[PDB]
Amino acid sequence: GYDRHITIFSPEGRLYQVEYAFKATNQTNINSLAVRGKDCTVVISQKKVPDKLLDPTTVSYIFCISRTIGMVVNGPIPDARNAALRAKAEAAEFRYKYGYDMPCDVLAKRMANLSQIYTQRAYMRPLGVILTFVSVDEELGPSIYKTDPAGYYVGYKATATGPKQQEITTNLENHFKKSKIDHINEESWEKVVEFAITHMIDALGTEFSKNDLEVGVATKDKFFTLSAENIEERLVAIAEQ
Amino acid sequence: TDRYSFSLTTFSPSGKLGQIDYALTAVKQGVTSLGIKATNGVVIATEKKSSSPLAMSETLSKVSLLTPDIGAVYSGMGPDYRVLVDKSRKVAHTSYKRIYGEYPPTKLLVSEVAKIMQEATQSGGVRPFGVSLLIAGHDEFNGFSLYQVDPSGSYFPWKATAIGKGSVAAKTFLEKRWNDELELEDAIHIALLTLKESVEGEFNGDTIELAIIGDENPDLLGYTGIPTDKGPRFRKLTSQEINDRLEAL
Amino acid sequence: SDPSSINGGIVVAMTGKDCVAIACDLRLGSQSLGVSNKFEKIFHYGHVFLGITGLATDVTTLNEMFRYKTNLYKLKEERAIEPETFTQLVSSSLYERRFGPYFVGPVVAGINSKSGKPFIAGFDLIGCIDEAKDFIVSGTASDQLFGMCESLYEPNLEPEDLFETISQALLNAADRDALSGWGAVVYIIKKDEVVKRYLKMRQD
Amino acid sequence: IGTGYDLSNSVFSPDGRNFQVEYAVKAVENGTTSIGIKCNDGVVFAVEKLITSKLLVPQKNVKIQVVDRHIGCVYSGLIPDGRHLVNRGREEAASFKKLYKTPIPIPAFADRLGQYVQAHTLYNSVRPFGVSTIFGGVDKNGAHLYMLEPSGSYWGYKGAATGKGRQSAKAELEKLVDHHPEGLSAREAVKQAAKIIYLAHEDNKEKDFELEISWCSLSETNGLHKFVKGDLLQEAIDFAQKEIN
Amino acid sequence: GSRRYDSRTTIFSPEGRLYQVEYALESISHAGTAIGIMASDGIVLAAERKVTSTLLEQDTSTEKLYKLNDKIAVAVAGLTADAEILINTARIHAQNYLKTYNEDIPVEILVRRLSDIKQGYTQHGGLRPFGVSFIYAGYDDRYGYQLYTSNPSGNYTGWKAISVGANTSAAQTLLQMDYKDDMKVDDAIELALKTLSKTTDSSALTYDRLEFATIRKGANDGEVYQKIFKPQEIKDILVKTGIT
Amino acid sequence: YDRALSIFSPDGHIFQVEYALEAVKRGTCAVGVKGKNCVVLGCERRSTLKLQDTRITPSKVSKIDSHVVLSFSGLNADSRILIEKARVEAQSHRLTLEDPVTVEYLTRYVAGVQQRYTQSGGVRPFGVSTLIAGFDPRDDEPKLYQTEPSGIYSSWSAQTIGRNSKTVREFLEKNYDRKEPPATVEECVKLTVRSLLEVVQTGAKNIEITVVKPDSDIVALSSEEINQYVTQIEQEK
Amino acid sequence: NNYDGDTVTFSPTGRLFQVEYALEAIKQGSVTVGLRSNTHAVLVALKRNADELSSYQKKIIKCDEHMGLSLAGLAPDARVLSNYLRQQCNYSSLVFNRKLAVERAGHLLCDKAQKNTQSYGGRPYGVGLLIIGYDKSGAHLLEFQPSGNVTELYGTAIGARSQGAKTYLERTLDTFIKIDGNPDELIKAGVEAISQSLRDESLTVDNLSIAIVGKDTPFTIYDGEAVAKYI
Amino acid sequence: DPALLRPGRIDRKVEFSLPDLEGRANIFRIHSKSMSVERGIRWELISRLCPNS
Amino acid sequence: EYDRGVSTFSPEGRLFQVEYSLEAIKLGSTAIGIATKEGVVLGVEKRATSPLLESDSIEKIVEIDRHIGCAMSGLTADARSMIEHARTAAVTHNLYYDEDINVESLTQSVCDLALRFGEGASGEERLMSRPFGVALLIAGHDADDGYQLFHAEPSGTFYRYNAKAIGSGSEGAQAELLNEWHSSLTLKEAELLVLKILKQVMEEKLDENNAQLSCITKQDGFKIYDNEKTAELIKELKEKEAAE
């Protein structure tokens, strides 16, 4: 009567409370697809904006956490900003006490521990978001690390999130089997944006206009988000493919 | 705030401690891991597991170095291992590397992490950790030694044992194949052979993470010329090196 | 004057060949008055020896402190402490009283039981790990002593020739100290036996 | 399925939803109409303030409180709870003003409140807020307008609304943004806030109401939040009558 | 609400009584058997492990015998994890009384301190008990060998011979029929093996399931010597008594 | 911790106090009778279980000072928590005002401890009830008080607490006279022993008697002395 | 149902019920009527004894040298909040040499009641105060609801049969605002207001407790034979 | 269930509570009138002695 | 209808523990108090539960200070805390103002104490787990109002009474005070009135080992009448009804 109401174990050895977080993640209906280019990492995501009255510039799910670390958020937007604030903060602190900008690997493990503690309390609600941290590291190159509400994480050759992500996982897996090279290759980042957009148009069975895309690319020593004006120049570049 | 200062491990009425019993269910859900104690090394072994092939296994870790003389490998939950490895490195420095200046013996460090266990089988707002660890190591006076730290917070010294979902079948194989002289190279052939019968998915030098606590390598020491210190005894085996010994079955 | 120079005392430790010896004098008094000649400054924890001179209250609180530690070490570990981790034990506990120190000087003399290897080390104040395999001097008459040890000492003496060497070095040095003289004890520590000898040192 | 799931809030329900916080959107539903029109040069808040008895003192109660000198904050739902959320952001804003000596940006301030309402949903021991606010103002980066749901959700807005008449309001703000999708004047927008409070008074046409209007505008007020009063307020009133005729 | 999920571990029942201390004792009846006999020339402590396996290292195990101080060792029966904590407390406290009074701590003092600690948890804090049962073998000059049992309630009672753990009723009855006042350690060695032989759940009792230690004044120079016997001497003394 | 474990009942009580009273009854039995110049607290001591020591096993009556004795019935575990405070307060009395404790004062303090644990957050109250007895210093009037878990104390001419306390107290209404105490100390031992052999029974091997005479005389009788009073009484009867 | 146990649990009707429950403490409470003009505020309270031997319980607490409050709920709850108002009235005189505004004092009061109703292990305060005062913008009458909510009125009531009192104030609404300077007349207009909240209990020289504050009159409490002219 | 308790199906809730001292006295007399009682019986003293009954 | 709080309401609007607390004043033993023009009389039924009880050293009248006295009824352990605070309180005022504290002002301090249960909130540091359930009759004399008698409740509200009874015999007692009291009665006729009303609701026998009288006069301060005077006064009541 109380075993699925705080994060204690059940007669099964499972934690249902921790499990319900994983059933909250996919209720926003926002998809993400992230591939590691040759010397960049490109992540493309939907940006659903329901009503006319939202100001669209403000609607986002690409958060700048450092110069080198972006963080792409699938799950409810309150939990998104609290995971995002804690991330920026920890990035500052690392810089402060160790004298170099924070490498992604370490931020991945740092937000993982905070996730772990949140399921070993009784007064803390695990944040129900899957965050994907995309980067370009100077020791380990372009990487993708995906953390989740439990506190597990693993690196990725590519990863996807959302409720239609079973589909996206299928396209990317075929792609890296056929080619037989773990990461996508193409030198210019602009064209990894093109390959990436095709794979979202094939998988979801939907076309995308400029206000429906919001694209983040971590290249070397900088993270930017493409303006919706610049995303159209990419949508045209798919018309000559 | 915090008002959770009451234990959520409580006595059950026909006896036993219900949370610790439950947590041991959660141990036997996870991967299979084993350890064989020789006369000159200890070998530890585990299987990698991913969501999809899109995960990398290269950046994954499941066998960790706590001190250069003492490694750990788990079977149970991924999250709980991850924090408890870090608390193990922490108490090992703070309570024997600042006080007696050196890494602690294997008996001592085991005893500290059982007390980390103990203070989440108790206190408020906490449940038990959901791993069982083998903490294998080498100290200078109890030899090579293999331990099993558990959700209860007990420890048992072992000579070969297994934990995880294939534990029941594994140890019977290991009871009959044990011998009172093994070399470390001969130890390996047992551990691989057993771990092959508990895998049914793919088998490679990239999907079996294997570690030896052999004998000293000065090529991992990082430096030369103080002969007083002798390099990592712990040495995780690369994918290439493991693959030869797989063919050797 | 300063805290050490009230109560005085020396401790001298000198290696032999496969043996070591630690020695002190028995005086314990304050300023001009010598009070007692039955306080030994040498204490031991298993097979390791620690003598300590200076501030008198701190001689005994460190004696008691060390005894607390090594009892805890011996119960957990299930062995006596080796000398090499003993050095480190002395060092650490000095350093957590960095601000306001114990005005002491511990001297460690032991035999590494694993290799049979004689082992000596010095400390003064807050820390400083004085590695030597020569000799160690401490206490107020560190001038008197340092000189003697350097002149007499020949490497690799038998434990009987070591007993003669150390007794001379302690004698002429103790009685050219104004804060010393009144007995002396010398513990010759072979790895088979520990013989305690009181010498005929003249009175002050 | 298991029984529970509505006695706290750091439970999740078996469908990953909340409770209390989903229940908290219904607390906000009983509230007074409150709209915000984003004009090009600032914001115009307007709020229906009911005269619930003939014993109230007219024009001496307010639900539009200023935070710093340039951010208006306007709320509906639980009115005491709503003052506390404004009160937290006057402490937060004041801290920002000392540390960096500039008026807290609207995107910075949005960020500061947001966390606060979200923090009360993370414990089982603090009651989630049952107010929705509309706040904005003019800072150095232009005008911005935010609505902050009780869920600790907020977004950008060109028009936002809350309370009982949120159905009529949301529909009437789509029309005004299709009249002027290229922007509209802040002088003008006073008069439109009047018109869309009187059409939204038709869920609540049982009673009689006082319209309170305020604006923070760059070109008439110099980017400082002031109240719409005097003759200008009576013009807007006469405007609303003629429209609803 | 937090109050909603509180156990209330530490109210009385209508009987006047503490459910959670009663249950704690229930679970120690599962745990390993430990018997202690105070001879008039020693104390023999012997306990039988609750688990056994042949791959299990049982040659340097000492998971039932723990030394608190130089003259006081205990046998453990219960939640071993809970016991490891209080053994390490005890060791801190025993060493402490020696630091400050420069005098061997009496058996009475250490035993009462440990009892009151258990006692704190059934009294307040809203926490579960420490389910541990200790048998204390200890020497002091004053009262000679002293023998003692403590329970999770945090109450201590003297014994001359006692048995805690599994099969308490069975072990206790056996001791009583045999026990004489004129017994030395040899008679005690024989009885401790023997009661354990009658409560055993193995087809024959063997040395690898026995842990065994004594404290004798018959060690040289009129000194108490704590000896935890090695499993190969236990196997030897097991041939002497003709159990195997 | 901070949660209430003692809470108001819809009746007029606190259930933890009524419960705590039930707890004293399930304990062993201590009896109190004062003479003209003695207190006598005697207590029933177990021996269902055998091979139990006698020297090292604690007694039921624990001397606080040299003139204040305390006996307790109910949980034998809890008992030691009330006594540890009581001994330290006696030394504090000596420190801060001088003179050793008066029996009335120690009884009022002990009452204040149990009183507090009936109303402080995160404690249950003690399931233990005392007969606190003794002499005032430089006086020789016998003082016998009994405090109970409520946190209320009463003085008594004679009293009994623990198992079957109603059965024993009935006996004491009929043989101890309020007007004329037992004429000497020895007559007073025969009364406490006469009372105990009703409920305790099973030889003189269970009966303990502590006798205090004025001027700091605490003596606890030997098994041989006890036998002797039990035998006389058995025979006369 | 199960929603009524604590102060943290919403509630499917948009409510929280416990604050709702604390609002019923005001209803079972005795009546006090406030009315103000443009120059003097009046609290007219009806005091309540238990039995014949009993005294009457003070219902008007002078809070400052220009403020007075009156309870209509829990007597222990009223004692907590009254200290808090005195404290903040005295902290204003000390630090800023400023008579604490009446409009500001409703906001200070406000937040002390909200912060125990948002919190766990707290409760709402089940007492409504009518707070009169004369400051720099004139007379003010505040009604403090145990909900935390403050409203500013020209005349109100709370108590039992209180509705009958709001009506007397509702009729006589355009009259009393216009009589200024003549405290005799406001007082009488408030005695008659609280008399339609009777039901065989009457008013006497031990039931009626009047206190006024004026432009030209600092805070005065009349009782005894000083409420014997004004029945 | 909440639906039953609203008026119009249960117009009036009629509350029954434990009696007071006078209350308890009447019930004792109503039982005791069929019993053989002496005149010495003062029921006032034994109703007082029974509380929350 | 509900009660799974600690400081919670109540559809009625009272605190819930407080409601129960008042119904444990029906399990008190009487304290009666008549205040007249010449002084205040306090009497109490002392109660003996056995005749092996020393009933002359149990007393339920306690002096707070010279000019304020108190009679307590309900549970007396609760009363132990509050009367201490009261002693303390009176003393503080003589320290700070060298003035004999008013009775009212004294009462008012102790009511603020009765409400201080909770889990730690507000401005008043909660440390009680449940409220008190004892009522006080604060008697006293001030130089501002003359003689005064207050009834302090565990609610936290205080009323000045001219006569009140509290305890198990409240109803039957205050029904009589109503009829028999008038504005002025001289002090020894007040003492006899206390003994008359105490006699009707008496469950024992009226004698001096189970009734205690006490006065407060300005000139004599607080005096608790010895058994010699309490006995005499009892005898003059059985005499005076004997002429009727």
UniProtKB/Swiss-Prot annotation, chain A:
There is a cross-link at K222 (Glycyl lysine isopeptide (Lys-Gly) (interchain with G-Cter in ubiquitin)). It comes from the Eukaryota. Keywords: Acetylation, Cytoplasm, Isopeptide bond, Nucleus, Phosphoprotein, Proteasome, Ubl conjugation. The keyword Nucleotidyltransferase does not apply. The modification Phosphoserine is found at S227. The keyword Acetylation applies. GO terms for biological process: proteasomal ubiquitin-independent protein catabolic process; proteasome-mediated ubiquitin-dependent protein catabolic process. It holds the Pfam family Proteasome_A_N. It is found in: Cytoplasm; Nucleus. One of its GO terms (cellular component) is proteasome complex. Its main location: cytoplasm. CDD domains: proteasome_alpha_type_6. The 26S proteasome consists of a 20S proteasome core and two 19S regulatory subunits. The 20S proteasome core is composed of 28 subunits that are arranged in four stacked rings, resulting in a barrel-shaped structure. The two end rings are each formed by seven alpha subunits, and the two central rings are each formed by seven beta subunits. The catalytic chamber with the active sites is on the inside of the barrel. Interacts with CIC1. Present with 15200 molecules/cell in log phase SD medium. Belongs to the peptidase T1A family. This is Proteasome subunit alpha type-1. It comes from Saccharomyces cerevisiae (strain ATCC 204508 / S288c) (Baker's yeast). The gene is SCL1.
Curated annotation (Swiss-Prot), chain B:
Keywords: Cytoplasm, Isopeptide bond, Nucleus, Proteasome, Ubl conjugation. GO terms for cellular component: nucleus; proteasome complex; proteasome core complex, alpha-subunit complex; proteasome storage granule. One of its GO terms (biological process) is proteasome-mediated ubiquitin-dependent protein catabolic process. InterPro entries: Ntn_hydrolases_N, Proteasome_alpha, Proteasome_alpha-type, Proteasome_asu_N, Proteasome_sua/b. SMART domains: Proteasome_A_N. It comes from the Eukaryota. Transmembrane segments: none annotated. It is found in: Cytoplasm; Nucleus. The keyword Lipid biosynthesis does not apply. Gene3D superfamilies: Glutamine Phosphoribosylpyrophosphate, subunit 1, domain 1 (3.60.20.10). The keyword tRNA-binding does not apply. It holds the Pfam family Proteasome_A_N. There is a cross-link at K107 (Glycyl lysine isopeptide (Lys-Gly) (interchain with G-Cter in ubiquitin)). The proteasome degrades poly-ubiquitinated proteins in the cytoplasm and in the nucleus. It is essential for the regulated turnover of proteins and for the removal of misfolded proteins. The proteasome is a multicatalytic proteinase complex that is characterized by its ability to cleave peptides with Arg, Phe, Tyr, Leu, and Glu adjacent to the leaving group at neutral or slightly basic pH. It has an ATP-dependent proteolytic activity. Present with 7060 molecules/cell in log phase SD medium. Belongs to the peptidase T1A family. This is Proteasome subunit alpha type-2. The gene is PRE8.
Curated annotation (Swiss-Prot), chain D:
Keywords: Acetylation, Cytoplasm, Nucleus, Proteasome. Its main location: cytoplasm. It holds the Pfam family Proteasome. Transmembrane segments: none annotated. Coiled coil: none annotated. It is found in: Cytoplasm; Nucleus. GO terms for cellular component: nucleus; proteasome complex; proteasome core complex, alpha-subunit complex; proteasome storage granule. It comes from the Eukaryota. Belongs to the peptidase T1A family. The proteasome degrades poly-ubiquitinated proteins in the cytoplasm and in the nucleus. It is essential for the regulated turnover of proteins and for the removal of misfolded proteins. The proteasome is a multicatalytic proteinase complex that is characterized by its ability to cleave peptides with Arg, Phe, Tyr, Leu, and Glu adjacent to the leaving group at neutral or slightly basic pH. It has an ATP-dependent proteolytic activity. The 26S proteasome consists of a 20S proteasome core and two 19S regulatory subunits. The 20S proteasome core is composed of 28 subunits that are arranged in four stacked rings, resulting in a barrel-shaped structure. The two end rings are each formed by seven alpha subunits, and the two central rings are each formed by seven beta subunits. The catalytic chamber with the active sites is on the inside of the barrel. This is Probable proteasome subunit alpha type-7. It comes from Saccharomyces cerevisiae (strain ATCC 204508 / S288c) (Baker's yeast).
From Swiss-Prot, chain F:
PROSITE patterns: PROTEASOME_ALPHA_1, PROTEASOME_ALPHA_2. CDD domains: proteasome_alpha_type_7 (cd03755). Keywords: Cytoplasm, Nucleus, Phosphoprotein, Proteasome. Coiled coil: none annotated. Its main location: cytoplasm. SMART domains: Proteasome_A_N. The modification Phosphothreonine is found at T57. It holds the Pfam family Proteasome_A_N. It is found in: Cytoplasm; Nucleus. It comes from the Eukaryota. GO terms for biological process: proteasomal ubiquitin-independent protein catabolic process; proteasome-mediated ubiquitin-dependent protein catabolic process. The keyword Endoplasmic reticulum does not apply. One of its GO terms (cellular component) is mitochondrion. The 26S proteasome consists of a 20S proteasome core and two 19S regulatory subunits. The 20S proteasome core is composed of 28 subunits that are arranged in four stacked rings, resulting in a barrel-shaped structure. The two end rings are each formed by seven alpha subunits, and the two central rings are each formed by seven beta subunits. The catalytic chamber with the active sites is on the inside of the barrel. Interacts with CIC1. The proteasome degrades poly-ubiquitinated proteins in the cytoplasm and in the nucleus. It is essential for the regulated turnover of proteins and for the removal of misfolded proteins. The proteasome is a multicatalytic proteinase complex that is characterized by its ability to cleave peptides with Arg, Phe, Tyr, Leu, and Glu adjacent to the leaving group at neutral or slightly basic pH. It has an ATP-dependent proteolytic activity. Belongs to the peptidase T1A family.
